[PDB]
Design a protein around this ligand. Structure first.
Ligand SMILES: CCOc1cc([C@@H](CS(C)(=O)=O)N2C(=O)c3cccc(NC(C)=O)c3C2=O)ccc1OC
Ligand SMILES: CCOc1cc([C@@H](CS(C)(=O)=O)N2C(=O)c3cccc(NC(C)=O)c3C2=O)ccc1OC
Ligand SMILES: [Mg+2]
Ligand SMILES: [Mg+2]
Ligand SMILES: [Mg+2]
Ligand SMILES: [Zn+2]
Ligand SMILES: [Zn+2]
Lengths: 325, 326
């Protein structure tokens, strides 16, 4: 009787789910149990006639293709982005904006968006003349690979969770998922944020402040920025969670810097364990990337993101206080 | 090697629009891409400039040429050789004299050589609609063109194939980026935006005191090279009619073989791919009117009047195909 796990999963609609605890309690299956919970919570198995055993088989297969020896880009991160997207989809300002297929696409994209990540950056893969960068012509190398793996796994035995979608539903979902995962490439962050800003400046809402998004171009942009916000949500979580994410990304960066040092490569910024300032890097990350993004998101869904933005600002203040004068 | 004498004579035409490329394919033992690339590299002194060992060049070209499908009617080594030679002529246009660097010239020619390698003879849309491994690998986005680049670059790593072994690291990095930008621009889903941008450049074009195009940033330079190789890829209707008609015969065979695969699957046969219900001549007139002439009249504007004879041939060939309809 793993009662504690079911207790933890009752917070699946809350920012700040104890995802490391869930990873522990589920036998390192946070992506499987959290995806399954969210699918039940959104009635997605009945809406898209997904057989429960096919869902569980695909989810375990997918989760198996996240590397257990990568400190950050692993199945716990995938589960975290899934659950974060699931909460952002319920923003009151986005009520009635997205179809069931759009909701399914955003959640599936979040689950697969880093699958088979090797724990090094696109630039490292390009600079080492990797087989991945040769395959993908140096362009969104990892993100194209995550998509290819995520979709390829649906072809394994009893893994096609979309088997009862119509032909046209499958084509539409595939296009949306590709557009969403490719937008998680940080080389696209600035263009994405500029478009989110444009939308905020021209946003149409109801009298009760709910966004009105009529064309696909605008809806997919909001979905791209939503999953991007979820991918960049660690500094907006309660500090005890955030500090664990910082420990993990820094371990991954340092392992990349050790591969670089050994090859005699230039050690990438923040990747040198002998010359790193973890706390200054987090404050810079918040000041130049995370807070501009989440402040713009909060304007789009004004005022529903205020608690999230409050947490980010508290955490920035705390990390800054750990830097001595 | 009377045959070798005849081949050498034919290769004296490598600077001319209308080279007898099908004859060269036969005379060279089905090595048109190898012999035309080698001729062009010698003509432009590229082996000396980039310290390319001649045996490495031939080894790579032969391997690249082998990775074109000898059993595909249109997208084979003869098409690659033709696009290479057509780009080589376009690079020599008076309006571009001394404009491009040796590395940019190398990039345009190499891109043309690899730009369709390992083409299976079916379209991107067919590969997407049939859930192919290629479309799965490339997320339905420029599926073939990404594959052609990955193959063309990967083959440089085979034994004695690295023709760029003596470039600097900065040269190799620059060449790789330019080649990717050029081959990705041969995806027809990019044609309309590529043409729109070329028109904008023509409308705003600056010429130097010597009368050549002024291109003073990467964006403009790569855009011209992208459209140049796209024009070469879309050059069949601008060639002498006896060449053009052979290219039409070949693309229609390839289309019909695709539509037969779509028939043997219950799919809606793609337009122009139904050998039981095609109009070859109407399709060429449509191709020229909606794609090839809008492109080439704009290229002709950019380099005016350098390409006037090419444009005149295109317009004559359009009239000829039109005359076969009534
Ligand atoms: C101080 C950075 O902190 C974090 C960074 C990240 C991730 C998000 S991503 C979607 O994987 O790119 N991230 C960046 O945003 C980023 C920008 C530039 C370079 C860079 N990588 C290297 C190897 O240089 C990264 C990087 O890996 C996640 C969590 C973090 O802190 C908890
Ligand atoms: C009447 C068309 O004639 C020709 C077409 C082509 C080629 C050039 S490409 C760079 O390979 O795309 N081409 C198109 O431009 C085109 C547009 C849309 C669909 C299409 N394919 C299918 C299966 O529908 C094609 C197509 O294969 C080359 C030579 C041709 O005539 C000599
Ligand atoms: Mg990622
Ligand atoms: Mg072959
Ligand atoms: Mg092509
Ligand atoms: Zn991620
Ligand atoms: Zn071609």
């Amino acid at each position: 009787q793993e009662d504690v796990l079911a207790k933890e999963l009752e917070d699946v609609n809350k920012w700040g789910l104890h995802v490391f605890r869930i990873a522990e309690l589920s036998g390192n299956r946070p992506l499987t149990v959290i995806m399954h919970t969210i699918f039940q919570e959104r009635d997605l198995l009945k809406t898209f006639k997904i057989p429960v055993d096919t869902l569980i088989t695909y989810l375990m297969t997918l989760e198996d293709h996240y590397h257990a020896d990568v400190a950050y880009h692993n199945n716990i991160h995938a589960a975290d982005v899934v659950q974060s997207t699931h909460v952002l989809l319920s923003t009151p300002a986005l009520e009635a904006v997205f179809t069931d297929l759009e909701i399914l696409a955003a959640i599936f994209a979040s689950a697969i968006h880093d699958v088979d990540h090797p724990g090094v950056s696109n630039q490292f893969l390009i600079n080492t003349n990797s087989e991945l960068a040769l395959m993908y012509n140096d362009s969104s190398v990892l993100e194209n690979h995550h998509l290819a793996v995520g979709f390829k796994l649906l072809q394994e035995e009893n893994c096609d969770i979309f088997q009862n979608l119509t032909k046209k539903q499958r084509q539409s979902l595939r296009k949306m998922v590709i557009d969403i995962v490719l937008a998680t490439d940080m080389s696209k962050h600035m263009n994405l944020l500029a478009d989110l800003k444009t939308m905020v400046e021209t946003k149409k809402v109801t009298s009760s402040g709910v966004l009105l998004l009529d064309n696909y171009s605008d809806r997919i942009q909001v979905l791209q920025n939503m999953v991007h916000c979820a991918d960049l949500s660690n500094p907006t979580k309660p500090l005890q969670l955030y500090r664990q994410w910082t420990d993990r990304i820094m371990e991954e960066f340092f392992r990349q810097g050790d591969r670089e040092r050994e090859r005699g490569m230039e050690i990438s910024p923040m990747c040198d364990k002998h010359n790193a300032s973890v706390e200054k890097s987090q404050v810079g990350f918040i000041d130049y990337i995370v807070h501009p993004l989440w402040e713009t998101w909060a304007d789009l869904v004004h005022p529903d993101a205020q608690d999230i933005l409050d947490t980010l600002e508290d955490n920035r203040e705390w990390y800054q206080s750990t830097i001595p004068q």
